[PDB]
Swiss-Prot record:
Catalytic reactions of this protein: AMP + ATP = 2 ADP
Top EC class for this record: transferase
Source organism of this protein record: Thermus thermophilus (strain ATCC 27634 / DSM 579 / HB8)
Name this protein carries in UniProt: Adenylate kinase
Task of the protein: Catalyzes the reversible transfer of the terminal phosphate group between ATP and AMP. Plays an important role in cellular energy homeostasis and in adenine nucleotide metabolism.
Gene giving rise to this polypeptide: adk
Free-text comment about domains: Consists of three domains, a large central CORE domain and two small peripheral domains, NMPbind and LID, which undergo movements during catalysis. The LID domain closes over the site of phosphoryl transfer upon ATP binding. Assembling and dissambling the active center during each catalytic cycle provides an effective means to prevent ATP hydrolysis.
Chain positions recorded as ATP binding sites: G12, A13, G14, K15, G16, T17, R124, G169
């Protein structure tokens, strides 16, 4: 048996930091498909040498390899943050969880009013000296995020596993809501 949690949320909602905190506190392994592969290629592993050519040609790593890496990495307790990105990946992941006896505790969707997300992003940008974030670009990136994520929200809501959480408040307040939503 195992348990999994998936985190979804727009830039500026701080969902990654909450995933990292839930990971550290309850013993979940936070997976990063990108990190695992980079590590494999770095160390020149047999798997790394096989994927190197795909990466150099500018191709994307096939979903079957990403799901294979996740299977090689599943543990009793796992957190996904930044995956799935597509409906095909969501479907494949559900099959993998089912096959490995891993129960999906919930898909956390951190929700924040758009005006606050924009204020937050523009503030951090001003402070860090970034020049790529202006109101227009930020609102557009948020609209793209909404368009790409909506199919996943529908997929999980239909299965009764979506946990919408209020992301306004201190990190501690949002964290408490996530634990309550998950029941852990």
């Amino acid at each position: 048996v195992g348990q999994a949690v998936i985190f979804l949320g727009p830039p500026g909602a701080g969902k990654g930091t909450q995933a990292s905190r839930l990971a550290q506190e309850l013993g979940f392994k936070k997976l990063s498909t990108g990190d695992i592969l980079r590590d494999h290629v770095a160390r020149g592993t047999p798997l790394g040498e096989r994927v190197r050519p795909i990466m150099e040609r500018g191709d994307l790593v096939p979903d079957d390899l990403i799901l294979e890496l996740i299977r090689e990495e599943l543990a009793e307790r796992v957190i996904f943050d930044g995956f799935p990105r597509t409906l095909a990946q969501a479907e494949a992941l559900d099959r993998l969880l089912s096959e490995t006896g891993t129960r999906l505790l919930g898909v956390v969707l951190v929700e924040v009013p758009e005006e606050e997300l924009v204020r937050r992003i523009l503030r951090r940008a001003e402070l860090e000296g970034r020049s790529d974030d202006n109101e227009e670009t930020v609102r557009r990136r948020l609209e793209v995020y909404r368009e790409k994520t909506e199919p996943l929200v529908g997929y999980y809501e239909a299965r009764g596993v979506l946990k919408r959480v209020d992301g306004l408040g201190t990190p501690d307040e949002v964290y408490a809501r996530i634990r309550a939503a998950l029941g852990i």
